Amino acid sequence: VNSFSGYLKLTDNVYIKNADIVEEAKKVKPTVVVNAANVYLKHGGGVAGALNKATNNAMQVESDDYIATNGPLKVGGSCVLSGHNLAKHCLHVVGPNVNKGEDIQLLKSAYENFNQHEVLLAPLLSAGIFGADPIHSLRVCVDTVRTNVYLAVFDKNLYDKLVSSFL
Numbered sequence: 304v305n306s307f308s309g310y311l312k313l314t315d316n317v318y319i320k321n322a323d324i325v326e327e328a329k330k331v332k333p334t335v336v337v338n339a340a341n342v343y344l345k346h347g348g349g350v351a352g353a354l355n356k357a358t359n360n361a362m363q364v365e366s367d368d369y370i371a372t373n374g375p376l377k378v379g380g381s382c383v384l385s386g387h388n389l390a391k392h393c394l395h396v397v398g399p400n401v402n403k404g405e406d407i408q409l410l411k412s413a414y415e416n417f418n419q420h421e422v423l424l425a426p427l428l429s430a431g432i433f434g435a436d437p438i439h440s441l442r443v444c445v446d447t448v449r450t451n452v453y454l455a456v457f458d459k460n461l462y463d464k465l466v467s468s469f470l
């Protein structure tokens with residue numbers, strides 16, 4: 304049993320809700336919130352910009368120290384950092400940016416990072432400003448993630464479309 308409320312169960316392990324991930328995180332305080340990161344951990348917009356804003360920029364300060372020490376992430380890769388006031392941990396995951404020419408096959412690799420955590424609150428990877436097809440992202444999620452994932456879809460129109468077209 305956990306504190307996630309109002310989700311539709313899609314499969315044994317995937318749950319979906321029309322919600323702002325920032326508001327879900329503040330309410331639930333999950334063990335792991337997933338950030339839709341870029342390789343530089345520059346949290347400017349979308350999920351990342353909004354999460355960072357909700358930490359009063361502490362996420363960005365921590366991230367800049369991480370990059371100064373370790374260099375950029377790989378597309379399809381991840382790192383675990385603090386969840387600040389939003390979660391115990393933040394799993395920063397880099398999905399491919401279709402607007403950067405990045406290989407959509409890396410979306411599966413990106414979702415594989417979720418399997419290192421028993422339960423996660425997450426956005427739809429590579430959706431929104433990353434330019435990928437969100438219907439495809441949900442399918443890859445369902446076919447890749449085996450741990451328990453609670454997906455927060457911001458746009459109600461998209462949520463309704465993802466549910467109604469789900470096989």
Ligand SMILES: O=C(O)C[C@H](NC(=O)c1ncnc2[nH]ccc12)c1ccncc1
Binds near residue numbers: 324349427430
């Ligand atoms: O979930 C979607 O609808 C895709 C994408 N989502 C996000 O950017 C997104 N998803 C979940 N919590 C969020 N909080 C702030 C942004 C954010 C989108 C948000 C709006 N307008 C267009 C796309």
